[PDB]
Amino acid sequence: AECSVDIQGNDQMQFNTNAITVDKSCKQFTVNLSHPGNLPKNVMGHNWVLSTAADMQGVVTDGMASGLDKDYLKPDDSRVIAHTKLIGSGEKDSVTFDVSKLKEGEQYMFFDTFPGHSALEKGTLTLK
Ligand SMILES: [Cu+2]
Ligand SMILES: [Cu+2]
Numbered sequence: 001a002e003c004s005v006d007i008q009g010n011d012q013m014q015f016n017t018n019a020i021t022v023d024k025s026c027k028q029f030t031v032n033l034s035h036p037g038n039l040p041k042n043v044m045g046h047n048w049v050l051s052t053a054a055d056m057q058g059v060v061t062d063g064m065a066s067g068l069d070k071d072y073l074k075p076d077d078s079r080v081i082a083h084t085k086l087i088g089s090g091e092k093d094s095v096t097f098d099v100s101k102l103k104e105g106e107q108y109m110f111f112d113t114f115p116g117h118s119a120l121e122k123g124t125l126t127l128k
Helices: 056-065
Strands: 004-008 019-022 028-034 049-052 092-098 108-111 122-127
Touching: 049 056, 056 108
Parallel strands: 004 028, 019 122
Antiparallel strands: 028 092, 049 108, 108 122
16 A cells, blocks of 8 residues: 655645545655745745644644744654654655554644644544
């Protein structure tokens, strides 16, 4: 089964899916994020961050408070299962993570932590 997915971060602030399914068959999984538009990361940055559904809000909140300079992530946030860099327009980033970190039966959220983006740029990831 495929073990990769193309996700995109927008001016318009939208993701092309609000749902990812990672085949249980996969040992690693990669997300390729990319950014349509013309604006710099300091103004319209996008990342893709993965955590447990429970943790999502804390990760978003602590990341907003850590600044641009930490890519909108609290440093050493152990709730983050995986994440890309914070990217701006014309920039791409990929993250590959161990599928051993995902427990079948858990609910995962992916989201962007640039201030305010996670209200639209959010989605479900499930292991199947
Ligand atoms: Cu496969
Ligand atoms: Cu964004």
